[PDB]
Amino acid sequence: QKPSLYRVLILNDDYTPMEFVVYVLERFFNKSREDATRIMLHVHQNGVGVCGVYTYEVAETKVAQVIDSARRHQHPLQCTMEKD
């Protein structure tokens, strides 16, 4: 076998509003309010949070969605993906 899915990470920063991060989790990562909150607080407290695991194509898409959204909202939020 060769598991080839990819996890999407959101990194913490001191400028992006908590509310925005919850928004990106609920929309771009299909998270419920409870799960989006959990992950958001994990980012805020631990410095990084796992948004989910997807195929390469989907991960690449969602990462782009997150950062594009962040910039359009004028936040410095960073997002990236790597092999699960």
From Swiss-Prot:
Taxonomy, superkingdom: Bacteria
S-S bridge residues: none
One annotated GO biological process: proteolysis
Signal peptide span: none
Family statement: Belongs to the ClpS family.
Its job: Involved in the modulation of the specificity of the ClpAP-mediated ATP-dependent protein degradation.
Subunit structure: Binds to the N-terminal domain of the chaperone ClpA.
Name of the protein described by the UniProt record: ATP-dependent Clp protease adapter protein ClpS
Organism, scientific name: Caulobacter vibrioides (strain ATCC 19089 / CIP 103742 / CB 15) (Caulobacter crescentus)
Residues of the full protein shown: 36 to 119 of 119
